[PDB]
Structure 1
Amino acid sequence: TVHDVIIIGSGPAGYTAAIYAARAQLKPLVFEGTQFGGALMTTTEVENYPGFREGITGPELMDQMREQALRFGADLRMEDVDAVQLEGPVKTVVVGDETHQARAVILAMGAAARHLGVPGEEALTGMGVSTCATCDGFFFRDQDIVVVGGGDSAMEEATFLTRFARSVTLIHRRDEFRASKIMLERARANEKITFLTNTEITQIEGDPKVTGVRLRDTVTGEESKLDVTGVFVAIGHDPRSELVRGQVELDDEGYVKVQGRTTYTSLDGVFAAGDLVDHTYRQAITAAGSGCAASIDAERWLAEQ
C-alpha cells in the first residue's frame, strides 16, 4: 500500500499540509509524534495568529487544526517516525516495528528551542518563562526581565524587549559573544540593557509566576538571586533534521534547504515546510503558510508523475 503522501510532524506546518492534501483527495497519512501539536501545544496565549480578534490558547488553536485535518480525511497517527528512506519513487517511514510507504513525503518536524534545563523552567513556561519576544514581550510592560543567550537571537530579543520592559538583564554563560558585532553593539548602546557574562541560571523561582532567577558565576562559582518577572530563553534552536541528515541537503546549522521560493528539497518527491526550514521568522502563521505551499508543491509534483 503506497500512499500518495506522508507528512511527518503535527505543528502548524504539518496540519496545514494535511488539510490541503486531504481536501485535494490525497488521503494524507500524518505521523504527529507522541509530543504532538507542535510548539504551541505548550504555550498559553496566541494573540498574533490572524483570525482571532480576542486570541486563542495554543492548545485550542492546534485542536482546531487537528480536527480540521480529520474532517477532510487525513489519517492522523500519534506516533514518532524513527527512520526514513526518502530516495527513489517509493519512500519508506519506519515507526517502531511498523513501516509505511508513499510517493511523496512532506517534512514538517519543526525546530526544537534549546532549553536552560533547570528547575522551574517547565513549571513557569507561559507563566513568565518565554521563548518568543515577538509573542510575549507585550506582557512584560514596565517589568524587570532577563534574556539568556549569546548570539544574534539573544541580542535581537533583548533590544526588541526594551520597548516594553523597564529593564533587560542579558545573561550569558561565557565572557565571549557569538553574536555579530552590529547586534552586540546595538545591545551595548541600549541604556535599558545590563550584561551579565560568565553567568548561568540554576533555577527559576515562582509561586504561580516567575519571581526571580538563581545565578551562578561559571568561573568563580559565586551564586546570587535576581528579582525578575520574566525569563526569555534565546540560546538558539535545533532544527529537527536528524531523520533526514545524509539524505536531504542541509545547511551548516542543520536546516533543510529548499529550492528558490518553493518547498522542494534536494530529493525528488520530498518537500519541507515550517521551522525545519525557516530560521528567520519562526511564527505559527508562517509555518502554516509554508505547510500549505508544501502540499500544493506535492500535489503538483504528484500530478507530473
Structure 2
Amino acid sequence: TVHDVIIIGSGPAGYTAAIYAARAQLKPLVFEGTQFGGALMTTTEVENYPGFREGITGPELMDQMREQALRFGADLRMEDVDAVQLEGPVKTVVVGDETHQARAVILAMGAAARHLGVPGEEALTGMGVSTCATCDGFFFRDQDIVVVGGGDSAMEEATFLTRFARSVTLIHRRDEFRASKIMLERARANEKITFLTNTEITQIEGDPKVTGVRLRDTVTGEESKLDVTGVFVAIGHDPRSELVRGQVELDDEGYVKVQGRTTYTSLDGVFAAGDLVDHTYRQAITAAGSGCAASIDAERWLAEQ
C-alpha cells in the first residue's frame, strides 16, 4: 500500500498540511510523534494566533487542529519516524519495526529551542520561563527579567523586551559575543539592559512562577542568586533535520532548503514546512501558513505524476 502523502510532524505546519491534504481527498498518513502537538503543546496562553479575540491555550489550539484534521479523514499516528528513504518515486518511513510508503512526503518536524538543561527550567515553562519574547514578552510588564545567550537572538530578545520589562539582565557564559556588532551595540546603548558575562544559570527558582535564578561565574565558580520573575532563553534553535541529512539539501545551520517562495526541497516529491525551514519568523501562524502551502505544492506535484 503506497499512500499519496505522508506528513512527518504534528505542530501547526503538519496539522495544517494534514487538514488541506485530507480535505483534498489524499488520505494523508501523519506521524505525530510521541511528543505530539508541536511547541505550543508546551506553552500556556497563545494570544497572537489570529482568530481568538480572547486567546486560547496552546494545548486547546493544537487539539482543535488535530480534531480538524481527523474530521476530514487524516490518519493520525502518535508515533515517531525513526528513519526515512526519500529518494525515488516511492518513499519509505520506518517507525520502530513498521514501514510505511508514499508518493509524496511533507517534512514538518519543526525546530527545537535549545534548553539550558537546569532544574526548574522545564517546570516553569509558561510560568515565567519563556523561549520567545514575541510570544510572551507582553506578560512581563514592569518586571525584572533575564535573557540568556550571546547571539543576535539574545540581543534582539533583550532589546525588544525593554518596552515591557522594568529591567533586563542579559546573561552570557563568556565575555565575547556571537552577536553582530550592530546588535551588540544596540543592547549596550539600551539603558534598561545590564550585562553579566562569564555567567551561567544553574537553577531557576519558582513558587509556582519564576522568583529568581541561581548564577555561577564560569571562570571563578563564584555563585549568587538574582531575584527575577522571568527568564527568556535565547541560546539558539536546532532544526529537526536529522532524519533527512544526506538526502535533502540543508543550509549550514541544518535548516531544510526550499525552492524560491515554495515548499519544494532538493528532492522530487519532498516538501518542507514550518520551523524546519523558517529560521526568521518562527510563529505558529507562519508555520500553519507554510503547512498549507506544502499541501498545495504536494497536491499539484502529485497531479503532475
TM-score relative to the length of structure 1: 1.00
Q: Which runs of 5+ in 1 are unaligned?
A: none
- Cα offset, 1:266, TM superposition: 0.2
Secondary structure of the structure 2 residue equivalent to 1:174: coil
Secondary structure of the structure 2 residue equivalent to 1:200: strand
How many Å separate the matches in 2 of 1:9 and 1:154? 27
- Cα offset, 1:229, TM superposition: 0.2
- Cα offset, 1:67, TM superposition: 0.1
Q: Does 1:193 align with 2:205?
A: no
- Cα offset, 1:182, TM superposition: 0.5
- Cα offset, 1:206, TM superposition: 0.5
How many Å separate the matches in 1 of 2:160 and 2:300? 40
Q: Where in structure 1 do 4 or more consecutive aligned residues deviate above 6 Å?
A: none
- Cα offset, 1:124, TM superposition: 0.7
- Cα offset, 1:35, TM superposition: 0.1
Deviations 1:36-55 (A, max 9, x none): 00000000000000000000
Deviations 1:201-249 (A, max 9, x none): 0000011100000000000000000000000000000000000000000
How many Å separate the matches in 2 of 1:91 and 1:208? 47
Deviations 1:127-160 (A, max 9, x none): 0000010011101000000000010000000000
- Cα offset, 1:172, TM superposition: 0.5
Deviations 1:27-76 (A, max 9, x none): 00000000000000000000000000000000000000000000000000
How many Å separate the matches in 1 of 2:114 and 2:144? 23
Secondary structure of the structure 1 residue equivalent to 2:210: coil
- Cα offset, 1:193, TM superposition: 0.2
- Cα offset, 1:94, TM superposition: 0.2
How many Å separate the matches in 2 of 1:174 and 1:243? 32
Secondary structure of the structure 2 residue equivalent to 1:54: coil
Q: Does 1:219 align with 2:219?
A: yes
How many Å separate the matches in 1 of 2:74 and 2:7? 10
Secondary structure of the structure 1 residue equivalent to 2:101: strand
How many Å separate the matches in 1 of 2:180 and 2:96? 43
How many Å separate the matches in 1 of 2:135 and 2:95? 34
Secondary structure of the structure 2 residue equivalent to 1:89: coil
Determine the structure 2 residue equivalent to 1:114. Answer: 114
Deviations 1:67-100 (A, max 9, x none): 0000000000000000000000000000000000
- Cα offset, 1:11, TM superposition: 0.1
Q: Does 1:142 align with 2:142?
A: yes
How many Å separate the matches in 2 of 1:16 and 1:151? 32
**Equivalenced residues, count:** 305
Secondary structure of the structure 2 residue equivalent to 1:293: helix
How many Å separate the matches in 1 of 2:35 and 2:123? 17
How many Å separate the matches in 1 of 2:2 and 2:123? 43
Secondary structure of the structure 2 residue equivalent to 1:69: helix
Q: CA RMSD in A?
A: 0.3
How many Å separate the matches in 2 of 1:255 and 1:181? 24
- Cα offset, 1:197, TM superposition: 0.5
Determine the structure 1 residue equivalent to 2:80. Answer: 80
How many Å separate the matches in 1 of 2:268 and 2:28? 18
How many Å separate the matches in 1 of 2:121 and 2:97? 35
Q: Does 1:47 align with 2:47?
A: yes
Secondary structure of the structure 2 residue equivalent to 1:109: coil
Q: Which runs of 5+ in 2 are unaligned?
A: none
- Cα offset, 1:265, TM superposition: 0.1
TM-score relative to the length of structure 2: 1.00
Deviations 1:249-298 (A, max 9, x none): 00000000000000000000000000000000000000000000000000
Aligned identity (percent) is 100
How many Å separate the matches in 1 of 2:208 and 2:268? 50
Deviations 1:85-127 (A, max 9, x none): 0000000000000000000000000000000100000111100
**1:163-242 alignment runs, 5 A limit:** 163-242=163-242
Secondary structure of the structure 2 residue equivalent to 1:53: coil
